[PDB]
């Protein structure tokens, strides 16, 4: 997902991300935690730079939302994006949606 | 002990002495007027008394009550000067009651007075011998057609002073405009009612946050914002 920033006077930027669930169900019915990774990117200079490395690990069947704060923002015409480095789940038992 | 010159002390210890002359200088430079020199009596030749080059003018003036005591309250001497001809009335209506000016008192023995005064001259003239004390006018206790009376005070008086003296306010800036603390020096921007203007004569700060934002000087705001939320 990508969006751009147009406001003139801002000093820091906060990204609120999360996962809908992370429970992993075995064939018998046991539940185990899983993990997922994200990248938050800002277009400094001419190439995208990954500001942060994010890893969420645990068991939950409801949304868990976390926030991280940025700084040293480039000049305003910059744009931002977030991307996923974990392969999209194919089996229905995995349930790790970013 | 004041560093009085030796010849003055030798004059003090003598059995028979020369006349003692008190010379008054009223300084209105800080207020905005000119300095005035007076003396109680004329010289021997019927001319104004000459000390150094000042040429103090004859005029009925007297000051009584001077003292050196720090145990109790301040001294507050009194000075009386006549205004039969209306001089003091004109200085009082021009210079706002002559309140805040300096009064300087000198005591010089007639022996050391300038040679111009005496008809035969003075062989002992020495312009360095005097005793000086400074005061500041405080009030005009009386003013009539006969005389006018002032009460002096020390320059270092502590009547209306509280020490820390700086108030933390939520909405008002305490600095002086364009002062050292405010640190603004630029084109005229606004009036005291946050109305745009460009004349330099009517450029004042409203001491409000908008009045400060007109100058883009929010960084140096005197007051501390959003305290009233906490105090509540």
């Amino acid at each position: 997902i990508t969006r751009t920033i147009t406001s003139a006077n801002i000093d820091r930027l906060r990204f609120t991300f999360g996962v809908q669930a992370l429970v992993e169900t075995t064939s018998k019915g046991d539940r185990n935690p899983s993990e997922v990774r994200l990248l938050v990117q800002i277009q400094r200079n001419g190439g995208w730079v990954t500001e942060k490395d994010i890893t969420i690990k645990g068991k939950t069947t409801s949304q868990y939302l976390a926030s991280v704060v940025m700084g040293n923002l480039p000049p305003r015409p910059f744009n931002i994006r977030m991307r996923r480095m974990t392969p999209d789940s194919t089996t229905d038992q995995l349930q790790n949606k970013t | 002990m004041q560093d009085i010159r030796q010849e003055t002390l030798n004059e003090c210890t003598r059995a028979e002495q020369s006349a003692s002359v008190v010379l008054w200088e009223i300084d209105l430079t800080e207020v905005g007027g000119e300095r005035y020199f007076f003396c109680n009596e004329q010289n021997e030749k019927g001319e104004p008394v000459t000390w150094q080059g000042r040429q103090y003018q004859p005029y009925p003036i007297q000051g009584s009550g001077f003292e050196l005591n720090g145990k109790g309250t301040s001294t507050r001497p009194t000075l009386t000067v006549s205004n039969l001809y209306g001089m003091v009335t004109g200085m009082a209506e021009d210079m706002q009651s002559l309140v805040g000016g300096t009064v300087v008192r000198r005591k010089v023995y007639a022996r050391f007075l300038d040679a111009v005064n005496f008809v035969n001259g003075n062989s002992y003239a020495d312009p360095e011998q005097e005793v000086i004390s400074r005061w500041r006018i405080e009030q005009c206790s009386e003013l009539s057609a006969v005389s006018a009376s002032f009460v002096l005070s020390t320059p270092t008086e502590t009547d209306g002073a509280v020490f820390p003296g700086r108030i933390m306010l939520a909405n008002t800036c305490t600095w002086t405009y364009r002062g050292d603390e405010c640190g603004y020096s630029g084109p005229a921007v606004a009036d005291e009612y946050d109305q745009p203007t460009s004349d330099i004569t009517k450029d004042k700060c409203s001491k409000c946050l908008s009045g400060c934002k007109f100058r883009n000087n929010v960084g140096n705001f005197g007051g501390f914002l959003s305290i009233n939320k906490l105090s509540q």
Partner: protein, 55 residues
């Protein structure tokens, strides 16, 4: 309850509005007037590029 006070020491945090800004002249423990105070949720990032959430 009989605690005795003096004019040159204060060890607790006082309200800000309408009060003077104090002056400190020597080495001493101080409690100071509060200009701001808030409670919010804390960000997970600790300032580094790598951040790990959960176990």
């Amino acid at each position: 309850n009989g605690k005795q006070n003096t004019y040159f020491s204060s060890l607790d945090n006082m309200v800000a509005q309408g009060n003077v800004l104090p002056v400190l002249y020597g080495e001493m423990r101080v409690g100071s007037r509060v200009v701001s105070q808030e409670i919010s949720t804390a960000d997970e990032g600790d300032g580094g590029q790598v951040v790990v959430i959960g176990r």
